[PDB]
Design a protein around this ligand. Structure first.
Ligand code: HEM
Length: 280
Protein backbone atom coordinates (compact mmCIF):
# COMPACT_ATOMS: atom_id res chain seq x y z
CA UNK A 1 0.00 0.00 0.00
CA UNK A 2 1.50 3.36 -1.00
CA UNK A 3 1.93 6.14 1.55
CA UNK A 4 0.52 8.63 -1.06
CA UNK A 5 -1.62 8.86 -4.22
CA UNK A 6 -2.01 11.63 -6.83
CA UNK A 7 -5.43 12.87 -8.06
CA UNK A 8 -6.11 15.07 -11.08
CA UNK A 9 -9.49 16.72 -11.50
CA UNK A 10 -10.88 18.85 -14.34
CA UNK A 11 -14.21 20.44 -14.84
CA UNK A 12 -15.65 22.55 -17.69
CA UNK A 13 -18.90 24.38 -18.11
CA UNK A 14 -18.80 23.46 -21.73
CA UNK A 15 -22.39 24.12 -22.82
CA UNK A 16 -23.15 22.67 -26.26
CA UNK A 17 -19.45 22.28 -27.11
CA UNK A 18 -18.06 18.86 -28.18
CA UNK A 19 -15.13 17.26 -26.48
CA UNK A 20 -11.77 18.51 -27.74
CA UNK A 21 -9.69 15.93 -29.53
CA UNK A 22 -6.50 17.10 -27.71
CA UNK A 23 -7.10 15.66 -24.16
CA UNK A 24 -3.60 15.43 -22.73
CA UNK A 25 -3.39 19.01 -21.59
CA UNK A 26 -7.00 18.85 -20.22
CA UNK A 27 -6.10 15.91 -17.92
CA UNK A 28 -2.80 17.33 -16.94
CA UNK A 29 -0.77 14.53 -18.66
CA UNK A 30 1.23 16.62 -21.14
CA UNK A 31 4.41 16.92 -18.90
CA UNK A 32 4.42 13.11 -18.58
CA UNK A 33 2.65 12.78 -15.20
CA UNK A 34 0.82 9.52 -14.36
CA UNK A 35 -1.64 10.32 -11.65
CA UNK A 36 -3.31 7.56 -9.70
CA UNK A 37 -6.90 8.80 -10.19
CA UNK A 38 -8.49 11.15 -12.73
CA UNK A 39 -11.94 12.73 -12.54
CA UNK A 40 -13.53 14.76 -15.34
CA UNK A 41 -16.79 16.77 -14.91
CA UNK A 42 -18.85 18.81 -17.41
CA UNK A 43 -21.96 20.94 -17.32
CA UNK A 44 -23.97 21.84 -20.43
CA UNK A 45 -26.84 20.61 -22.58
CA UNK A 46 -27.84 17.33 -24.27
CA UNK A 47 -25.30 14.77 -23.10
CA UNK A 48 -27.70 11.86 -22.31
CA UNK A 49 -29.87 11.96 -25.43
CA UNK A 50 -26.80 12.88 -27.42
CA UNK A 51 -28.50 14.24 -30.53
CA UNK A 52 -25.04 15.40 -31.83
CA UNK A 53 -23.83 11.75 -31.76
CA UNK A 54 -20.73 12.80 -29.85
CA UNK A 55 -20.60 9.91 -27.35
CA UNK A 56 -18.53 7.58 -29.53
CA UNK A 57 -15.78 10.14 -30.13
CA UNK A 58 -15.56 10.90 -26.45
CA UNK A 59 -15.26 7.18 -25.69
CA UNK A 60 -13.05 6.31 -28.64
CA UNK A 61 -10.64 9.23 -27.96
CA UNK A 62 -10.43 8.94 -24.16
CA UNK A 63 -10.65 5.11 -24.01
CA UNK A 64 -7.96 5.30 -26.63
CA UNK A 65 -5.51 7.40 -24.66
CA UNK A 66 -5.85 6.31 -21.01
CA UNK A 67 -5.71 2.54 -21.63
CA UNK A 68 -1.95 2.56 -22.66
CA UNK A 69 -1.16 4.23 -19.32
CA UNK A 70 -2.93 1.53 -17.37
CA UNK A 71 -6.12 3.34 -16.32
CA UNK A 72 -9.49 1.67 -15.76
CA UNK A 73 -12.81 3.64 -15.99
CA UNK A 74 -14.63 3.11 -12.73
CA UNK A 75 -17.76 4.96 -13.96
CA UNK A 76 -19.15 7.46 -16.50
CA UNK A 77 -22.48 9.07 -15.54
CA UNK A 78 -24.34 11.55 -17.74
CA UNK A 79 -27.61 13.44 -17.53
CA UNK A 80 -29.11 16.11 -19.75
CA UNK A 81 -27.05 18.83 -18.02
CA UNK A 82 -24.05 17.11 -16.28
CA UNK A 83 -21.29 14.53 -16.72
CA UNK A 84 -18.85 12.86 -14.37
CA UNK A 85 -16.18 10.24 -15.17
CA UNK A 86 -13.72 8.70 -12.78
CA UNK A 87 -10.62 6.67 -13.71
CA UNK A 88 -8.13 4.78 -11.54
CA UNK A 89 -4.86 3.00 -12.42
CA UNK A 90 -5.74 -0.73 -12.69
CA UNK A 91 -2.87 -1.61 -10.33
CA UNK A 92 -4.73 -0.19 -7.30
CA UNK A 93 -8.11 -2.05 -7.65
CA UNK A 94 -9.12 -4.97 -5.37
CA UNK A 95 -12.50 -5.89 -6.75
CA UNK A 96 -14.07 -7.19 -3.59
CA UNK A 97 -13.22 -4.17 -1.37
CA UNK A 98 -13.76 -1.45 -4.08
CA UNK A 99 -17.49 -0.93 -3.37
CA UNK A 100 -17.95 1.24 -6.59
CA UNK A 101 -21.20 3.24 -6.20
CA UNK A 102 -22.77 6.29 -7.82
CA UNK A 103 -25.86 8.23 -6.99
CA UNK A 104 -27.70 10.90 -8.85
CA UNK A 105 -29.67 13.62 -7.13
CA UNK A 106 -32.37 15.66 -8.94
CA UNK A 107 -33.83 18.88 -7.48
CA UNK A 108 -36.41 19.80 -10.18
CA UNK A 109 -39.08 17.88 -12.06
CA UNK A 110 -37.19 18.27 -15.37
CA UNK A 111 -34.04 16.73 -13.89
CA UNK A 112 -31.85 19.65 -15.13
CA UNK A 113 -30.45 20.64 -11.68
CA UNK A 114 -28.84 18.46 -9.09
CA UNK A 115 -25.66 16.48 -8.78
CA UNK A 116 -23.72 13.22 -9.13
CA UNK A 117 -21.52 11.38 -6.60
CA UNK A 118 -19.14 8.54 -7.47
CA UNK A 119 -17.30 6.81 -4.61
CA UNK A 120 -14.88 3.84 -4.37
CA UNK A 121 -12.38 2.35 -1.98
CA UNK A 122 -8.70 1.58 -2.49
CA UNK A 123 -6.29 0.40 0.16
CA UNK A 124 -9.23 0.63 2.59
CA UNK A 125 -9.61 4.43 2.01
CA UNK A 126 -12.87 5.79 0.54
CA UNK A 127 -12.82 8.42 -2.22
CA UNK A 128 -15.89 10.39 -3.26
CA UNK A 129 -16.17 12.71 -6.30
CA UNK A 130 -19.12 15.09 -6.69
CA UNK A 131 -20.32 17.43 -9.44
CA UNK A 132 -23.37 19.61 -9.37
CA UNK A 133 -25.49 22.08 -11.39
CA UNK A 134 -27.99 24.73 -10.33
CA UNK A 135 -29.94 27.45 -12.18
CA UNK A 136 -30.16 30.99 -10.93
CA UNK A 137 -33.99 30.92 -10.94
CA UNK A 138 -34.89 27.61 -9.10
CA UNK A 139 -36.39 27.04 -5.70
CA UNK A 140 -34.11 24.80 -3.75
CA UNK A 141 -33.60 23.07 -0.33
CA UNK A 142 -31.22 25.86 0.40
CA UNK A 143 -33.21 28.85 -0.84
CA UNK A 144 -30.06 29.97 -2.60
CA UNK A 145 -28.84 29.68 -6.27
CA UNK A 146 -25.67 27.78 -5.27
CA UNK A 147 -25.13 24.26 -6.48
CA UNK A 148 -25.16 22.57 -3.03
CA UNK A 149 -27.43 19.85 -1.59
CA UNK A 150 -26.60 17.90 1.57
CA UNK A 151 -27.31 14.65 -0.20
CA UNK A 152 -24.25 15.20 -2.43
CA UNK A 153 -21.98 15.94 0.54
CA UNK A 154 -20.38 12.67 1.75
CA UNK A 155 -18.70 14.45 4.68
CA UNK A 156 -22.19 14.76 6.28
CA UNK A 157 -22.59 11.00 6.48
CA UNK A 158 -22.49 8.90 9.62
CA UNK A 159 -19.44 7.26 8.02
CA UNK A 160 -17.75 10.02 5.99
CA UNK A 161 -15.37 9.36 3.11
CA UNK A 162 -11.58 9.71 3.63
CA UNK A 163 -10.92 11.85 0.49
CA UNK A 164 -13.66 14.09 -1.06
CA UNK A 165 -13.59 16.27 -4.16
CA UNK A 166 -16.39 18.55 -5.49
CA UNK A 167 -15.77 19.79 -9.12
CA UNK A 168 -17.93 21.86 -11.44
CA UNK A 169 -19.52 25.26 -11.93
CA UNK A 170 -20.98 25.76 -8.40
CA UNK A 171 -23.08 28.77 -9.62
CA UNK A 172 -20.93 30.96 -7.40
CA UNK A 173 -20.15 34.36 -8.99
CA UNK A 174 -18.33 37.63 -8.28
CA UNK A 175 -20.69 40.05 -6.59
CA UNK A 176 -19.51 43.47 -7.88
CA UNK A 177 -19.97 45.51 -11.07
CA UNK A 178 -18.04 44.75 -14.27
CA UNK A 179 -16.08 48.00 -14.29
CA UNK A 180 -14.52 47.35 -10.93
CA UNK A 181 -14.01 43.65 -11.58
CA UNK A 182 -12.24 44.38 -14.93
CA UNK A 183 -10.04 46.99 -13.18
CA UNK A 184 -8.96 44.40 -10.62
CA UNK A 185 -8.22 41.85 -13.42
CA UNK A 186 -6.06 44.42 -15.26
CA UNK A 187 -4.16 45.13 -12.00
CA UNK A 188 -3.73 41.35 -11.40
CA UNK A 189 -5.30 41.83 -8.02
CA UNK A 190 -6.73 38.32 -7.85
CA UNK A 191 -7.18 38.29 -4.08
CA UNK A 192 -8.82 41.77 -4.20
CA UNK A 193 -11.36 40.56 -6.68
CA UNK A 194 -11.87 37.26 -4.73
CA UNK A 195 -13.03 39.41 -1.84
CA UNK A 196 -16.32 39.78 -3.82
CA UNK A 197 -16.67 36.08 -4.72
CA UNK A 198 -19.79 34.29 -3.37
CA UNK A 199 -18.17 31.10 -1.99
CA UNK A 200 -17.67 32.72 1.39
CA UNK A 201 -21.30 33.81 1.33
CA UNK A 202 -22.39 30.25 0.61
CA UNK A 203 -20.30 29.05 3.51
CA UNK A 204 -21.70 31.68 5.93
CA UNK A 205 -25.05 30.08 5.06
CA UNK A 206 -23.61 26.59 6.01
CA UNK A 207 -23.23 25.46 2.46
CA UNK A 208 -19.93 23.77 1.42
CA UNK A 209 -19.19 23.77 5.18
CA UNK A 210 -15.56 22.73 5.88
CA UNK A 211 -14.74 22.40 2.12
CA UNK A 212 -11.48 24.01 1.04
CA UNK A 213 -10.52 25.57 -2.23
CA UNK A 214 -6.90 25.68 -3.28
CA UNK A 215 -5.38 29.19 -3.57
CA UNK A 216 -6.55 30.88 -6.81
CA UNK A 217 -3.84 32.76 -8.77
CA UNK A 218 -5.52 32.70 -12.19
CA UNK A 219 -7.83 35.30 -13.67
CA UNK A 220 -11.62 34.76 -13.84
CA UNK A 221 -12.52 31.90 -16.16
CA UNK A 222 -15.81 33.54 -17.40
CA UNK A 223 -17.28 35.19 -19.45
CA UNK A 224 -15.10 35.18 -22.57
CA UNK A 225 -15.70 35.87 -26.25
CA UNK A 226 -15.17 32.40 -27.71
CA UNK A 227 -11.73 31.87 -29.32
CA UNK A 228 -10.20 34.94 -27.59
CA UNK A 229 -8.76 36.06 -24.28
CA UNK A 230 -11.25 38.92 -24.26
CA UNK A 231 -13.88 39.24 -21.61
CA UNK A 232 -17.43 39.71 -22.57
CA UNK A 233 -18.28 42.36 -20.01
CA UNK A 234 -22.05 41.69 -20.32
CA UNK A 235 -21.32 39.66 -17.15
CA UNK A 236 -19.00 40.48 -14.25
CA UNK A 237 -15.86 38.34 -14.71
CA UNK A 238 -16.18 35.36 -12.25
CA UNK A 239 -14.66 32.05 -11.22
CA UNK A 240 -17.21 29.50 -12.45
CA UNK A 241 -15.57 26.04 -12.58
CA UNK A 242 -14.12 25.30 -9.09
CA UNK A 243 -12.39 22.42 -7.20
CA UNK A 244 -13.05 21.90 -3.54
CA UNK A 245 -11.57 19.23 -1.28
CA UNK A 246 -12.16 17.78 2.14
CA UNK A 247 -11.45 14.76 4.33
CA UNK A 248 -13.98 13.29 6.66
CA UNK A 249 -11.22 11.39 8.63
CA UNK A 250 -8.29 13.78 9.29
CA UNK A 251 -6.32 12.78 6.15
CA UNK A 252 -3.94 15.23 4.55
CA UNK A 253 -4.84 16.41 0.99
CA UNK A 254 -2.27 18.74 -0.51
CA UNK A 255 -3.00 20.67 -3.61
CA UNK A 256 0.04 20.71 -5.98
CA UNK A 257 -1.40 22.82 -8.81
CA UNK A 258 -4.71 24.73 -9.46
CA UNK A 259 -5.03 26.39 -12.86
CA UNK A 260 -7.38 27.45 -15.61
CA UNK A 261 -6.36 26.06 -19.06
CA UNK A 262 -6.32 29.09 -21.27
CA UNK A 263 -5.33 26.96 -24.35
CA UNK A 264 -8.91 25.72 -24.44
CA UNK A 265 -10.73 28.80 -25.79
CA UNK A 266 -13.64 27.24 -27.64
CA UNK A 267 -16.19 28.65 -25.32
CA UNK A 268 -17.21 31.29 -22.78
CA UNK A 269 -15.65 29.42 -19.80
CA UNK A 270 -12.09 28.06 -19.53
CA UNK A 271 -11.62 24.54 -17.98
CA UNK A 272 -9.96 24.24 -14.49
CA UNK A 273 -7.37 21.60 -13.60
CA UNK A 274 -6.35 20.70 -10.10
CA UNK A 275 -3.64 18.27 -9.03
CA UNK A 276 -3.47 16.91 -5.54
CA UNK A 277 -1.44 14.53 -3.48
CA UNK A 278 -3.25 12.60 -0.81
CA UNK A 279 -1.66 10.87 2.24
CA UNK A 280 -3.47 7.61 3.04
C1 HEM B 1 -22.36 18.17 -27.00
C2 HEM B 1 -21.45 17.81 -26.11
C3 HEM B 1 -21.27 16.41 -25.62
C4 HEM B 1 -22.10 15.33 -25.75
C5 HEM B 1 -23.47 15.39 -26.39
C6 HEM B 1 -21.44 14.23 -25.15
C7 HEM B 1 -21.92 12.90 -25.08
C8 HEM B 1 -21.26 11.87 -24.41
C9 HEM B 1 -21.82 10.59 -24.16
C10 HEM B 1 -23.21 10.19 -24.61
C11 HEM B 1 -20.87 9.85 -23.54
C12 HEM B 1 -21.03 8.42 -23.02
C13 HEM B 1 -21.30 7.46 -24.18
C14 HEM B 1 -20.98 6.01 -23.81
O1 HEM B 1 -20.69 5.65 -22.63
O2 HEM B 1 -20.99 5.16 -24.75
C15 HEM B 1 -19.74 10.69 -23.37
C16 HEM B 1 -18.60 10.32 -22.70
C17 HEM B 1 -17.65 11.24 -22.31
N1 HEM B 1 -17.51 12.52 -22.79
FE1 HEM B 1 -18.80 13.47 -23.76
N2 HEM B 1 -20.20 14.59 -24.79
C18 HEM B 1 -20.09 15.90 -24.94
C19 HEM B 1 -19.04 16.74 -24.61
C20 HEM B 1 -17.96 16.44 -23.82
C21 HEM B 1 -17.01 17.34 -23.31
C22 HEM B 1 -16.89 18.82 -23.58
C23 HEM B 1 -16.11 16.63 -22.59
C24 HEM B 1 -14.92 17.19 -21.99
C25 HEM B 1 -13.85 16.45 -21.77
C26 HEM B 1 -16.56 15.27 -22.60
C27 HEM B 1 -15.92 14.25 -21.97
C28 HEM B 1 -16.48 12.96 -21.97
C29 HEM B 1 -15.81 11.91 -21.22
C30 HEM B 1 -14.57 11.94 -20.42
C31 HEM B 1 -16.56 10.79 -21.43
C32 HEM B 1 -16.26 9.38 -20.90
C33 HEM B 1 -15.34 8.65 -21.96
C34 HEM B 1 -15.00 7.22 -21.60
O3 HEM B 1 -15.77 6.29 -21.87
O4 HEM B 1 -13.93 7.00 -21.07
N3 HEM B 1 -17.65 15.21 -23.43
N4 HEM B 1 -19.96 11.88 -24.03
Amino acid sequence: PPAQLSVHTVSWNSGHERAPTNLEELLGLNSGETPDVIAVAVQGFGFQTDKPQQGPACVKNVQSLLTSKGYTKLKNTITETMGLTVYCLEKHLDQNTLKNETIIVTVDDQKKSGGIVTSFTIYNKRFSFTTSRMSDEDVTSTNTKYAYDTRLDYSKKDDPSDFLFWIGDLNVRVETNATHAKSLVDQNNIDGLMAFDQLKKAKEQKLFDGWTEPQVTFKPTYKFKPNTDEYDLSATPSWTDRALYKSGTGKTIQPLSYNSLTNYKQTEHRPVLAKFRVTL
